[PDB]
Design a protein around this ligand. Structure first.
Ligand SMILES: Cc1cc2nc3c(=O)[nH]c(=O)nc-3n(C[C@H](O)[C@H](O)[C@H](O)COP(=O)(O)O)c2cc1C
Ligand SMILES: Cc1cc2nc3c(=O)[nH]c(=O)nc-3n(C[C@H](O)[C@H](O)[C@H](O)COP(=O)(O)O)c2cc1C
Lengths: 167, 151
């Protein structure tokens, strides 16, 4: 008999290549008393069996989705997300990639809106320096944009402010 | 933020018309730190979002709500999932358990919690057969032993 893994019905599904998003997802999971699930081991049930779903991904290549997310994107497209509360967080480097900043978060946003999820947790682009981002809509981000490479000292505050809006 | 409803990953989907199975499922869940879900309000997610699935039904001979809602069972991915069965049933025994046993086996759910018939569901009981009508003082003991076999 295995534990559910968290008290609250929160599933944080993430992808990571160098561990930055993995650590951020675990930090987010703790605050909401949720589970941190790697997209490589996630199931469609992980997308559906939660009252609040949070998807996280870094941006790799030329503004593309992280490789595990692309391979496992079926688990997302085959999940019933209609009317489900969904939030997004993205890791990226705004200094070295100012034209494709957290672009993978925008790719995930398009994918969950098509499946009918109610997306919450929009953030402002004020403290960020970037030229273009697929994660930007109406002058704001579709979720929490974090830069562990050059702005790690601000992620702790950004996570604190972002979560308070999700509850 | 809503709680999952149980600490352990156990979902007890049951069916009851008079309240006998309902009460037994509640007790089993409390002991296993699981959720008790009526099949009328159950979801396919309730079938899949657990490491141990426990299906309960009275014999009336499947209970009417279970047949009407059998979609949720046939459309749930139980392949390789651990599933256990408990059945409620002198005047007649736990026949609906066997109908529920066949369904989960057809889905591909590894069935556990087989029970001795010493007290249509070989030579061993496929799950916890409970007779609340005339043997209720032994149901608590039968549950105790059954839980030991599941852990
Ligand atoms: C080859 C490569 C391409 C990247 N492309 C982008 C990009 O287009 N946009 C962005 O915001 N960050 C980009 N980054 C930065 C990463 O997304 C950032 O380091 C992130 O924190 C990595 O998360 P992880 O360590 O969990 O994999 C790139 C990094 C590398 C190594
Ligand atoms: C019409 C009818 C048929 C029944 N058929 C069976 C049967 O074949 N086998 C059995 O063991 N019990 C049978 N029972 C007994 C019930 O399964 C038993 O009373 C059970 O505890 C009912 O559970 P519930 O009150 O949660 O619905 C039947 C009861 C009724 C009213």
């Amino acid at each position: 008999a295995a534990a559910r893994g968290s008290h609250m019905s929160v599933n944080v599904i993430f992808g990571s290549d160098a561990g930055a998003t993995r650590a951020v997802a675990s930090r987010i999971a703790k605050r909401l008393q949720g589970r941190a699930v790697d997209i490589k081991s996630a199931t469609t049930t992980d997308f559906e069996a939660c009252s609040l779903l949070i998807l996280g991904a870094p941006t790799y290549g030329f503004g593309d989705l992280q490789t595990d997310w692309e391979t496992n994107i079926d688990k997302l497209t085959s999940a019933n997300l209609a009317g489900k509360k969904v939030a997004l967080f993205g890791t990226g480097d705004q200094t070295n990639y100012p034209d494709s900043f957290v672009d993978a978060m925008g790719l995930l946003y398009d994918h969950v809106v098509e499946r009918g999820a109610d997306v919450v947790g929009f953030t402002e682009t004020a403290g960020y320096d970037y030229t273009a981002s697929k994660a930007e809509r109406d002058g704001r981000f579709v979720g929490l944009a974090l830069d562990e490479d050059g702005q790690s000292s601000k992620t702790e505050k950004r996570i604190t402010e972002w979560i308070s809006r999700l509850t």
